Structures are given as C-alpha cells and as structure tokens.
Scaffold this active site. Structure first.
Site, short mmCIF file in Angstrom:
data_model
loop_
_atom_site.label_atom_id
_atom_site.label_comp_id
_atom_site.label_asym_id
_atom_site.label_seq_id
_atom_site.Cartn_x
_atom_site.Cartn_y
_atom_site.Cartn_z
N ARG A 1 0.85 -1.19 0.00
CA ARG A 1 0.00 0.00 0.00
C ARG A 1 0.89 1.24 0.00
NH1 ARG A 1 -5.09 1.26 4.18
NH2 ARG A 1 -3.40 1.26 5.73
N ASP B 1 -5.24 1.82 12.82
CA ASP B 1 -4.25 2.68 12.16
C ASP B 1 -4.58 4.15 12.38
OD1 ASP B 1 -6.34 3.29 10.44
OD2 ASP B 1 -5.43 2.35 8.68
N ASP C 1 -11.58 5.67 7.99
CA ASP C 1 -11.29 6.77 7.06
C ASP C 1 -12.58 7.33 6.45
OD1 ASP C 1 -8.71 7.94 6.71
OD2 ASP C 1 -7.96 6.06 5.90
N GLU D 1 -12.82 4.71 0.49
CA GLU D 1 -12.77 5.22 1.85
C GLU D 1 -12.95 6.74 1.89
OE1 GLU D 1 -7.85 4.80 2.00
OE2 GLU D 1 -9.06 4.21 3.74
O1 LIG Z 1 -8.23 -0.36 11.25
C1 LIG Z 1 -7.70 -0.39 10.12
O2 LIG Z 1 -8.16 -0.02 9.02
C2 LIG Z 1 -6.26 -0.97 10.04
C3 LIG Z 1 -5.53 -1.64 11.11
C4 LIG Z 1 -4.28 -1.96 10.54
C5 LIG Z 1 -3.10 -2.63 10.97
C6 LIG Z 1 -1.83 -2.47 10.60
C7 LIG Z 1 -0.88 -3.32 11.21
C8 LIG Z 1 -1.42 -4.20 12.04
CL1 LIG Z 1 -0.49 -5.37 12.91
S1 LIG Z 1 -3.15 -4.00 12.12
O3 LIG Z 1 -4.31 -1.51 9.24
N1 LIG Z 1 -5.49 -0.92 8.95
MG LIG Z 2 -7.78 4.08 5.45
#
Ligand SMILES: O=C(O)c1cc(-c2ccc(Cl)s2)on1
Ligand SMILES: [Mg+2]
Length: 714
Positions: free
Chosen positions: A328, A620, A449, A421
C-alpha cells in the site's frame, strides 16, 4: 547539504545510495536513466497532482457554504443532490462494463480468504504476515478466547488437558462441517489411509471415505500411514497433521497433532496508515524491508519455503508457503523531504512511492537468490488509499503507466487496489472502477477513514452522532452494500477482490468468530485481519460460507440508492444527556492521546492500544481522523466547550500514561502538558481539525513527529 542533484531534483543521500546499491542491481534498469525518469515523471505529474488537491478544497468550500446559507429543518435531499451535481461532486454514472484486468494471480481472482495488513517498517511483523499463509488452528483456539476460559478450562503456565480437549473437539466439528465423511464423524476417527487415490478414515466399527472424494487434495509420508492429510474446501486448504508421539497427539483418538489452515492468502505491506515515516531515513527503512521481502532474503527469523505434498494418485506437487504480497503506497496528499526541488519544495510522496515500490517489486517477479517470491503471472499489486473520485483514479493509473515506462515494464504490470474510503469515491464508485478497468484488482471498504471523511464533508451541517453510533448509520450500511454491488456488476467475481474492513479488537476472538462471518455472507471475497492468529480464525468463516455462490446470488441487485449514500449522519434534536456527552468526549480524547503518544514519541503507527475501557484495539492512523473530526464537529456546533476538550485531554493523559507502564522507553505526558510534543499534537488535531484538508491528520502528525526527532537530536 547532503543531497544529490538529478536535474531539478535534490535527492537525500540515504535514498540515492539505497536505490543505487540495493534496489537497482538485478533489475537491469540503467541507473542513470532511472533517475532521469524520476526527474521527468515528477516534473510532468506534479502540477496535475496539485490541481487535484486544490479541486478537493474548492469542492469542500462550496459544500461548506451551501450548508451555512441554509437554515432549514431537515436537508432537502432533492435539492442537495442537484447541488452536488452542478458543482461536479456527483458525476453521471457510466454504462455497464466488465473490467479487463489481466495477468492476475489465483489468490486474487479466485480464492476467497483473509487478508492481512501489516506495517512495512516492522520487519518482524512483515515476516510473520508473509508466513501467515499457513497457520495452526490448535494454536489459534487454545491461545485465544474462542475456547472459553471457563472453570477448569483456563490457560495456565503449562498445558491444560481439559482445554486442549475442547480445542480438539472444536476442530473435529470444523472438519465434519467442512469436509464431511460419507458416514460418521471425524470425532470418532481412528486413523487415516490412502488406498488407491482415495482417502480412507477408520471409525471404531467401520471405515469410510469423504462424502465428496474430490476434497481430498493430498498427503505426506507413505499412504499406509501418512504423516499428514491435505484437504480442500471452497478453494482453501486444510491439513491434518498425524503424530501420536506429540504432546497433543498422544492423547488423540486418531493420533492427530494439529489442524493447519490456509489463512492469509494475501497480505498488504503497508507504507501508509499503519506506519510512521516522516523523512528520508524512515522511507529508506520501509523500502529496505519491502526489498528484502521481494528478494526473499529479509531476516529479523526468515521467509518460509513452499510446501511439498504427494498427490492422491501418487504423483508430486507443491503449494505456495507465503502470502501473496500487495504494497500500500501513500495517497495523493503528502509531500516528503526525501526529495526536494531546487526551490526547496518537497516532492509528492505518492509519486515517489510508485517509482520506488514499483522498482523494488521487480525483484519479486524473479528468483530469490529458491523459486521467485511473489507474482508468477508477472503483476505488481499496489493499494492506493484516500482517492477522491474518478479523476484521482485516472491520475493514479497515469502515474503507473509513466512508472512502467521508466522501469521498462509492460503496460498494466502495476495493478491497482482501489480503497473506497472517501465519500466522493463512494458516490462515483462505478466511474472510479471504470477509470481503472484494465488495472483494478480490488475494491475495499472500511469504517474509520470513510467515516472521518463523512464528518468533515458535512462539518457545517450540524452536530454528528457519536462514534459508536456511526457504525450502524444508514449512510454506512448503504456504502457497504453499494461497494459490493458496484464490484459484482463490474464483473469482479472470478476476476478481482471485493474486500471489507479490519477487525480491530485483537483479544476479542470469540466475538470475531461469532460476528465477522457477516462479511463473507455479504459477498466479500476478502476481509482484513490484524494478526496471523486472526487470519486462521477468520479462515473458518470462508469454510462455512460459499462466497462465490453468495456473489452469484447478488448479481444484478441494486441494494443501495444515491439518497441512502447521501444521508448525512446528523444527531437528532437534543440527543444526549450531559453524562453521555462527557463519555464521548473522554472516549475520543483517550483514543487520540493513546495513538498519538506512540506515533510522535516512538514512531510506532500500529500496536495493541488499550481503549478507555481497557479493550485492546489495533487501529491505524484513521482512528485519529475520525476522533479528531467528531470532537472538532462537536466544538463547532456548541455541543462542548474548549474547556471541556482541555479538561478531557488532561483527564485522559495520566490514564494513557499508566496504560503504557510496560514500556521501558515511554515518557509520560502528565503533568507537564505543554512540554509534551505528543500532548500538543493531540490538542492541535482537535482544535485545528475543522481546518485540515478533508480532516487529514498527516500534516500535523508529520510536523510534530519531525519536531520530536529534532529535539531528541540534542
Ligand atoms: O483499522 C484499520 O483499518 C487498520 C488496522 C491496521 C493494521 C496495521 C498493522 C497491524 Cl499489525 S493492524 O491496518 N489498517
Ligand atoms: Mg484508510
């Protein structure tokens, strides 16, 4: 300074060296022409990049003014929608089409299963995710609350046999439900044989085969008493490991040691919201891990090899031992000083990410030193977050085309995973897919988001409902269904992933197993999990639900209207008692402080963060966008005062302090608040929230983290 001149660009030396010494050799790209490409791509696309960002601003200003010039009871949807049309926010929907994306691996086109997202700056995490393609069901059940820690079945310093037996019974039940026997149950199995291409399971009184012999996919060891039996169900493998001499095997009626599930079929290596990278040194660290993954030599613990099996007939074959990797990139907004122009102006980070993660990904398309690490069909898979509308999608595709030229790759090598998003993407989704019709390999929804954008967009409309309420609002349920509908109508079934959001409550696995099943039931061929353990447990859902059948049943349905998508989540009249207002304020301030303190002080963008009720959440950066936007919205419409905000930040800070007791390198925020760069970051996010472009938290976070790094360098 310490920069390298390449035309109009001034490249940070650490980045220049990294690319020349580590990234370029083996790719057969001329170093000189690569760098000339960088300069030419940056020069050509920067103005369109900036034009798109100003367009967001102008659209938002017009919506702000629309709301402010009105004083009416509920929003007139008809008027509102006509207004969005006139200003170019809501574009006409194009005719039906089928995506033409080609050269995509089976993990993406065909296989439905869990998808892991992991911070690329953390080599340990990334390695664990890459290896998470296969995981132990027994470990996943014994280790979490999916098996209740009732009296007698609790986890202690050593093996609990009562609990182990619950684990075993649970998985026996899974096998009966997933790969049923002709007669009887795996619960009574006594041994496994392969007799002439066919699986034979011994029961106490008789023996039996599978109700569907075709689910037998293979074995290891000799057919007369195999060491493992491999099954397949809905495209996902299940492996029964046989060893009567193991801790668990000795106590088992068939001598079964474990059940291994194919879990994280794909993984997203993340440079965006799960990491903190605010300069050239931070970017190089991420690039270096991404390179190690693609060359297959990352070590911190190494990458798994493929798995060897004997076919049922007696032949030989092999299955991938690693999750298929996406990366990403960051989105269109931020710049980064890893490269500046002669004027001192920072270069757009999304542009750099395409060039560098794209360059680096070339290694994953060839032999590691073993077989080639990643895509066997020759594709590079890039998730592009935070895009607003089909023009921004078309721009990303043009950036990819230009990078492909610089790299000497065939056109459309670089595939796109479109995050849905942002609201202007949501209401124009079909057009966004069409803009990438030859590159798109997924679309995906999420809570944080998209909700943050919803709040910022209608910021001037009035006070919004509480954060916990957002998850069940009409706009978001419509958003979820509309995403699936647009994907299936664009022909995603059999071609591209249709994905849903992250389960954030890392310790609440019983709840996840109970509830996350809703996502594949809604036709999602994939959904995000926080850990290899959650990947293995979520894999259970894909054994129970036939996603392909579900998708086929949803074909042609229009389950969300434009009106539902546009239903602003405004609170009713006088919705909250004073205690409720205070809880929500505290909740949001704790969310911000808890995440911000690790980000600013330690440069950690993802971790298990205790919430206000001490529930462990792995969110995140988007958790920041939503919380800061809601508080900014409540402050804007007089729901709360600036003293309420201040008091809550001060009440929550010591709490966050004691929540970080286990951390040797933690520095407390209380009692000297205006000395703590992190505390000040949290405050700025709230008080300046309404003025941040689309509510994005990066400009502030990045600034504060850079400020912290400068202080510590003294
Ligand atoms: O809540 C979210 O969208 C989300 C959570 C994460 C994580 C990254 C690394 C992790 Cl270990 S969990 O990425 N996007
Ligand atoms: Mg996002």
């Amino acid at each position: 300074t310490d920069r390298v001149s390449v035309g109009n660009l001034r490249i940070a030396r650490v980045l220049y060296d990294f690319v020349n010494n580590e990234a370029l050799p083996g790719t057969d790209i001329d170093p000189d022409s690569f760098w000339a490409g960088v300069d030419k791509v940056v020069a050509d696309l920067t103005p369109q990049n900036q034009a798109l960002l100003n367009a967001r601003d102008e659209l938002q200003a017009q919506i702000d003014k629309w709301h402010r010039r009105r004083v009416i009871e509920p929003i007139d949807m008809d008027a509102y929608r006509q207004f969005l049309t006139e200003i170019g926010y809501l574009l006409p929907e194009p005719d039906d089409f089928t995506i033409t994306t080609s050269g995509v691996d089976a993990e993406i086109t065909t296989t439905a299963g869990p998808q892991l997202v992991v911070p690329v700056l953390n080599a340990r995490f990334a390695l664990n995710a890459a290896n998470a393609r296969w995981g132990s069901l027994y470990d996943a059940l014994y280790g979490t609350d999916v098996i209740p820690e009732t009296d007698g079945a609790e986890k202690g310093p050593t093996y609990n046999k009562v609990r182990g037996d619950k684990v075993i019974a649970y998985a026996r039940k899974f096998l009966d439900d997933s790969v049923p026997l002709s007669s009887g149950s795996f619960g009574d199995a006594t041994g496994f044989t392969v007799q002439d291409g066919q699986l034979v399971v011994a029961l106490p009184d008789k023996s039996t085969g599978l109700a569907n012999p075709g689910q037998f996919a293979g074995y290891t060891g000799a057919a007369e008493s195999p060491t493992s039996v491999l099954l397949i169900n809905h495209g996902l493998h299940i492996e029964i490991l046989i060893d009567p001499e193991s801790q668990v095997g000795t106590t088992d009626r068939a001598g079964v040691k474990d059940v291994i599930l194919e879990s994280a079929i794909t993984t997203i290596m993340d440079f965006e919201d799960s990491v903190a990278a605010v300069d050239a040194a931070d970017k190089v660290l991420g690039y270096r891990n991404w390179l190690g993954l693609n060359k297959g030599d990352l070590a911190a613990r190494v990458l798994n090899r493929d798995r060897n099996y004997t076919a049922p007939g007696g032949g030989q074959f092999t299955l991938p031992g690693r999750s298929l990797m996406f990366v990403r990139n960051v989105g269109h907004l931020m710049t980064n000083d890893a490269i500046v122009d002669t004027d001192g102006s920072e270069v757009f980070e999304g542009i750099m990410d395409a060039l560098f993660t794209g360059l680096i990904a070339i290694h994953g398309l060839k032999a590691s030193d073993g077989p080639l690490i990643n895509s066997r069909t020759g594709s590079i898979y890039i998730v592009k977050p935070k895009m607003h509308g089909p023009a921004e999608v078309a721009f990303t595709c043009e950036l990819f085309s230009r990078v492909e030229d610089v790299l000497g790759l065939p056109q459309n090598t670089m595939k796109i995973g479109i995050m849905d998003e942002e609201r202007r993407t949501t209401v124009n989704l079909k057009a966004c897919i069409k803009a990438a019709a030859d590159r798109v390999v997924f679309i995906n929804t999420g809570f944080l988001d998209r909700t943050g954008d919803e709040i910022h967009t209608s910021m001037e409309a009035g006070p919004m409902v509480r954060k916990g309420t957002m998850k069940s609002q009409p706009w978001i349920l419509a958003y979820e269904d509309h995403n699936v509908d647009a994907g299936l109508a664009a022909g995603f079934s059999g071609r591209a992933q249709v994905g849903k959001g992250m389960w954030t409550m890392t310790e609440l696995m019983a709840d996840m197993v109970e509830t996350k099943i809703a996502q594949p039931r809604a036709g999602a061929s994939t959904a995000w999990v926080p850990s290899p353990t959650a990947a293995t447990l979520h894999a259970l859902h894909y054994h129970q639900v036939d996603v392909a059948a579900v998708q086929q049943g949803l074909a042609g349905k229009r389950r969300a209207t434009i009106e539902q998508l546009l239903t602003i989540p405004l609170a009713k009249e006088l919705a909250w008692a004073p205690d409720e207002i205070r809880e929500e304020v505290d909740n949001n301030c704790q969310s911000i402080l808890g995440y911000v303190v690790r980000w600013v002080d330690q440069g950690v963008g993802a971790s298990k963060v205790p919430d206000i009720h001490d529930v462990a959440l792995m969110e995140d950066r988007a958790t920041l966008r939503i919380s800061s936007q809601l508080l900014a919205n409540w402050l804007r419409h007089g729901v709360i005062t600036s003293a309420d905000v201040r008091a809550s930040l001060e009440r929550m800070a010591p709490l966050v302090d004691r929540q970080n007791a286990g951390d040797v390198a933690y520095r407390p925020m209380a009692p000297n608040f205006d000395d703590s760069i992190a505390f000040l970051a949290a405050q700025e996010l709230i008080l300046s929230g309404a003025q941040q472009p689309n509510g994005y938290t990066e400009p502030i976070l990045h600034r504060r983290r850079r400020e912290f790094k400068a202080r510590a360098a003294e």
